[PDB]
Amino acid sequence: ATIGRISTGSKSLDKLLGGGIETQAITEVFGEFGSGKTQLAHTLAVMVQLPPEEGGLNGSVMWIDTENTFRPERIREIAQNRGLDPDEVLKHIAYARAFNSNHQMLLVQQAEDMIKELLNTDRPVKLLIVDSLTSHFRSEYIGALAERQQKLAKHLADLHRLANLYDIAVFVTNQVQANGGHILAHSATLRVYLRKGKGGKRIARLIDGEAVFSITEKGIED
Numbered sequence: 481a482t483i484g485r486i487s488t489g490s491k492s493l494d495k496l497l498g499g500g501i502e503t504q505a506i507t508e509v510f511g512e513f514g515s516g517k518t519q520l521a522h523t524l525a526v527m528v529q530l531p532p533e534e535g536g537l538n539g540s541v542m543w544i545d546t547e548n549t550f551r552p553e554r555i556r557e558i559a560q561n562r563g564l565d566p567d568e569v570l571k572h573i574a575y576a577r578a579f580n581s582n583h584q585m586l587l588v589q590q591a592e593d594m595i596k597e598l599l600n601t602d603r604p605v606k607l608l609i610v611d612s613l614t615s616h617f618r619s620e621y622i623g624a625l626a627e628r629q630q631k632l633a634k635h636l637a638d639l640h641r642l643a644n645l646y647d648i649a650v651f652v653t654n655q656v657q658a659n660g661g662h663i664l665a666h667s668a669t670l671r672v673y674l675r676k677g678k679g680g681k682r683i684a685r686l687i688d689g690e691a692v693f694s695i696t697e698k699g700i701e702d
């Protein structure tokens with residue numbers, strides 16, 4: 481398949497990304513608590529449902545939530561302010577809460593079943609969100625970094641296999657703050673550092689110019 485792009489909702493961020501986040505890729509956004517990573521995830525879950533003329537892929541979404549941070553009412557707001565029907569937008573987001581890191585790993589295998597079911601339809605899965613990808617692994621493997629890296633590596637390999645095999649954009653979030661971080665090392669296809677700036681602006685930079693955007697009723701925008 482050709483590489484598809486999903487607009488983030490922000491012209492500035494899209495330019496930094498070359499048009500949007502890519503299918504057949506894992507995009508990792510990392511930054512401190514409150515930097516806006518989950519807002520970007522919510523926005524992408526709407527944007528992907530637009531037609532290509534508007535920066536989407538007419539796609540369905542799968543969302544693995546590890547922190548109980550998915551907000552359907554926020555999806556509704558973004559959809560209503562992106563000219564979509566909120567009920568339809570929510571009906572094309574498959575949502576699961578990961579209870580721990582092992583269940584999170586099983587959910588990726590389960591996601592493949594729904595991906596296959598939708599593959600030849602008019603609304604194939606085009607976006608798989610894992611938010612937060614690292615939070616369970618971090619809390620469960622304190623003092624056991626070597627084992628944590630083994631399990632994370634297999635998890636990321638599973639996510640790569642889905643992105644490439646089924647032409648999906650995988651979007652993952654990673655909280656990194658004071659003294660913290662191996663990030664995801666070199667595993668993602670693309671690392672985006674997100675931070676707060678003056679006056680509530682958010683600033684994004686590719687790791688390995690900068691885009692500037694705001695969080696609004698449209699999700700994010702310039």
Ligand SMILES: Oc1cc2ccccc2cc1O
Nearest residue numbers: 542543574575576587590591
């Ligand atoms: O109904 C489902 C929703 C999911 C969401 C995320 C990952 C896997 C899922 C599997 C389902 O059957």
